[PDB]
Paper text:
This regulation is achieved by borate transporters (BORs), which are homologous to the SLC4 family.
The protein yields of these mutant AtBor1s were more than 10 times lower than wild type, but we obtained a stable protein sample from an AtBor1 active mutant ([name]/[name]/[name]) using [name] detergent. The putative substrate binding site cannot be accessed from either the cytosolic or the extracellular sites, defining this class as an occluded conformation. Importantly, our AtBor1 occluded structure resolved the large intracellular loop between TM10 and TM11. Interestingly, residues 369–373 and 457–460, which form short β-sheets (β1 and β2) between TM10 and TM11 in our IF and IAI structures, switch their fold to an α-helix and loop, respectively, in the occluded conformation. By uncovering the structure of the intracellular domain located between transmembrane (TM) helices 10 and 11, we observe that phosphorylation of Thr410 within the intracellular domain allows this residue to interact with a pocket of positive charge at the cytosolic face of the transmembrane domain.
Numbering used by the authors: 5 to 267, 278 to 431, 440 to 516
């Protein structure tokens, strides 16, 4: 717990894999788009829902534009100078709850009111940034190492329950009347309300089930490998588009709003000095709560994306990441947008998608090399050496760790068997000798953040998405927030 020690160590570690990060990201060509698109959807949909929730709960002060811009800018800055580019930054539910509490507090004060809410929030963000700077400088993130696997599994389960509760609440609200829309409307009759609720159930469950099914496309006996990979990669975005199209089928026999549909930044510094100084000090309290929450969430989200099972080859940056989070919180407060923060399950989902990308790249390369070798000599031990050489050649040269390397050829595999091709199937055998590796780089995070930003200018296209799609996706992400963690497995076994 020495001042500035952790930050300096983290910077030392990360500054020697920076150009490597960028060149590795560019090494993959357009194949980097699949994880990028997957994480872009996973980041944009919850943020848009949170933006709608804040617009309803803040009388139009904060909308989806602000949440999207915060997510995009914070993500881009973290991608370029972050320290741990696996982390995905976004506006989380606890932030929404705290901002709702703050808005409710400020609406009941004649001194603050509604036209000074953003300025008071900015002062809260200044206090939070100061607290985060103090915590990072003192190495308070060292206690993160102490928290064990259960301390992260419980948080994952809590986030899963929160996402499921959000999905169920959205589905139930599809059955009720909104508190802001015109009450005397054709689309809001009890019969049409029941119809809307049932249609939303159909669409949400259809999206959930089809996406969960298409997530297993690669392990199918039908179709071609190209089509199987395309489905396994883009099924959830494709399902979003397909169920959006399905929602338009009955449009010739229903009222306008059946089903219900969805719908830069500025500065608040000038009016930030108009807040009386009894609430600038009073911002310390919600600032303390938000600082503790962010200290916990950023760290746990970063460590859940850095599981030992992924065999990552680059160091962690907990202290430096917390310092940068302080800076980003200060910037977001000055810009009048809610702060971003490391979020789950987006971060582990990003890590898993990158691991899958590396696995597929390696499988393609090794299959090609094995097929090339089968024709020439194919001695089954000289071909394994060729595959090992290709694996080593593909890898990126670093200084910290070394590539895991292909694992041992199983005794049963050799006992079963130049090499006879009838008795040695490459597709069956490659999977048995591929390690778990992650394609670590900064390009996927940067592109996902830029896409989230461009969603700001793509609002008319976003106007065509029903909210049932959002609730189905929230359920899909809640299930993704327990992708087979040890704690959930143990609960299943009991």
């Amino acid at each position: 717990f020495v001042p500035f020690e952790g930050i300096k160590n983290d910077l030392k570690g990360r500054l020697m894999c920076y150009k490597q990060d960028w060149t590795g990201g560019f090494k993959a060509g357009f194949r980097i788009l699949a994880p990028t698109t997957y994480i872009f959807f996973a980041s944009a949909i919850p943020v848009i829902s949170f933006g709608e929730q804040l617009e309803r709960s803040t009388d139009g002060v904060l909308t989806a534009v602000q949440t999207l811009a915060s997510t995009a800018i914070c993500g881009m800055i973290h991608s370029i100078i972050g320290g741990q580019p696996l982390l995905i930054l976004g506006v989380a539910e606890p932030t929404v709850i705290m901002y709702t509490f703050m808005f409710n507090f400020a609406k009941a004060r004649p001194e603050l009111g509604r036209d000074l809410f953003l300025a008071w929030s900015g002062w809260v963000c200044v206090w939070t940034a100061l607290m985060l700077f103090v915590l990072a400088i003192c190495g308070a993130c060292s206690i993160i190492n102490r928290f064990t696997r259960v301390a992260g599994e419980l948080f994952g389960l809590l986030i899963a329950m929160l996402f499921m509760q959000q999905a169920i609440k959205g589905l139930v609200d599809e059955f009720r009347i909104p508190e802001r829309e015109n009450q005397k409307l054709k689309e809001f009759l009890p019969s049409w309300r029941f119809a809307n609720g049932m249609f939303a159930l159909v669409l949400s469950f259809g999206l959930l089930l089809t996406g969960l099914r298409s997530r297993k496309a690669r392990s199918w006996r039908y179709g071609t490998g190209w089509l199987r990979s395309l489905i396994a990669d883009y099924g959830v975005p494709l399902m979003v588009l397909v169920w959006t199209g399905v929602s338009y089928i009955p449009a010739g026999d229903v009222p306008k709003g059946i089903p219900r549909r969805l719908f830069g930044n500025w500065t608040v510094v000038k009016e930030m000095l108009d807040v009386p100084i009894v609430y600038i000090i009073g911002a310390f309290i919600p600032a303390s709560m938000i600082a503790v929450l962010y200290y916990f969430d950023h760290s746990v989200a970063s460590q859940l994306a850095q599981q030992k099972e992924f065999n990552l080859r680059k160091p962690s940056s907990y202290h430096y990441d917390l310092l940068l989070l302080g800076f980003l919180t200060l910037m977001c407060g000055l810009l009048g947008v809610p702060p971003s923060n490391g979020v789950i399950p987006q971060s582990p989902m990003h890590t898993k998608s990158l691991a899958t990308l590396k696995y597929q790249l390696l499988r393609n390369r090794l299959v090609a090399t094995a097929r090339r070798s089968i024709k020439t000599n194919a001695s089954l031990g000289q071909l394994y050496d060729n595959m090992q050489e290709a694996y080593h050649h593909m890898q990126t040269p670093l200084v910290y760790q070394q590539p895991q390397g292909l694992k041992e050829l199983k005794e049963s595999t050799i006992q079963a068997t130049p090499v006879d091709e009838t008795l040695f199937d490459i597709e069956k055998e490659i999977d048995d000798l591929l390690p778990v590796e992650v394609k670590e780089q900064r390009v996927s995070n940067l592109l996902q953040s830029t896409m989230v930003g461009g969603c700001v200018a793509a609002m008319p296209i976003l106007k065509m998405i029903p909210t049932s799609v959002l609730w189905g996706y929230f359920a899909f992400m809640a299930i993704e927030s327990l992708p087979g963690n040890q704690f959930w497995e143990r609960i299943l076994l009991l």
